[PDB]
């Protein structure tokens, strides 16, 4: 269904008596062409929460064009699977305008874009904001490392909204995940799962994960993978 | 003096009666070609200890020969000037070996090339050995990153015999450098400039090296940038 699918596929969503809520676009040859109009079904439409749109095309140029929209605070936008969209950093100030004013977005999806730490920085912007409501946010392959760390243990504590932070298969460093314990036990709300699968450690720092688990028993799993 | 100038020159330095103790070869166009003849030096002469030939294209084929005559724990050898030599982590386990058998090399300089991470975990199976007494090794521009830490970490409280450690002007990581902190204090003998210069920090970080200045008097210093 490539970008002209969406084109009309669009006259339904944007339709009257149109109740969709969830819709499934994953792998549809799209590309940014398209995000004029799914940011217009955004827009207007008045039960679609839930969009996912990624392994697609939709590069930090396409996003930017959602966002544009989904910023919008009157959005039903509730969880938004940006997944493989191939975005960079560049776009993330655009993530991070969303998340700071659509005060209806509690998940988003951000595995396999290559943001690096740039783009983590720039998102930590509009997480940290007093009106950003995201609970799930999902970071596995997305090319972070450990200077990022810094950014993510900010999260980790001074993010209210919180609940989970998939962090994955990227690599991140044991010793930034050792901070990440220690900041945690200072009454974290991140009580979901932290992610760290396919994220290999050190004696030391494993060893730091299970005695988190034990002290803040509050948390649900760190889920490591070994 | 390219590499035809030291064969000339090595006839002299192999020479009965040469007392020369320090040579510096450095910038002279030379290639690993000349290190078969410097190699003998190291090995024959009773008197070469300081030997600079950094800023070079001696690269890690070169430095092969050279440790295979300088690990010869009764080669006189005691100041490596390996600088900018052009290596990488390959000739970290010849470099290794130097130091673990050579018991006579006390100063190391490896500023300037690209070993990584991969090259400090090579050189750390030398400097943690018990007959390695290398007092100063310098690793400045180095390439190293914040996954060298754990090593580094080790090197700093499980070396006897190092004295001073010039980290220098890669990114290693802010974090990493808490780390140390944390370790140095653990009864170091690493009382010598800690390098870290041209490396910026966050305001923890640099709180921290002020903090172990202070804590632990016997260091001479940390020496940051701002």
């Known amino acids: 269904l490539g970008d002209f699918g969406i084109r009309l596929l669009c006259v339904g969503l944007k ?10 676009l994953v792998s549809c040859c799209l590309t940014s062409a398209c995000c004029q109009d799914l940011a217009s079904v955004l827009s207007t439409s008045h039960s679609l929460t839930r969009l ?14 959602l966002c544009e929209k989904a910023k919008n605070p009157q959005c039903n936008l509730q969880k938004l699977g940006l997944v493989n969209s191939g975005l960079t950093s560049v776009c993330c100030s655009a993530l991070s305008s969303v998340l700071s004013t659509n005060q209806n977005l509690t998940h988003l999806y951000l595995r396999g874009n290559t943001l690096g730490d740039k783009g983590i920085k720039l998102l930590c912007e509009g997480l940290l904001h007093p009106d950003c409501k995201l609970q799930v946010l999902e970071l596995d392959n997305c090319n972070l490392t450990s200077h990022c760390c810094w950014d993510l243990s900010t999260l980790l504590t001074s993010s209210q909204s919180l609940r989970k932070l998939s962090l994955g298969n990227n690599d991140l460093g044991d010793l930034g995940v050792m901070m990440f314990c220690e900041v945690l036990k ?27 688990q034990e002290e803040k028993p509050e948390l649900t799993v760190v889920f490591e993978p070994s």
């Open 15 to 24: 339709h009257l008596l149109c109740n969709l809520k969830k819709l499934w």
């Open 186 to 212: 200072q009454q974290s709300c991140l009580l979901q799962n932290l992610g760290l699968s396919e994220m290999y450690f050190n004696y030391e720092t494993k060893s730091a994960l299970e005695t988190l």
């Open 52 to 65: 996912y749109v990624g392994e697609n095309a939709l590069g930090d140029s396409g996003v930017a064009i």
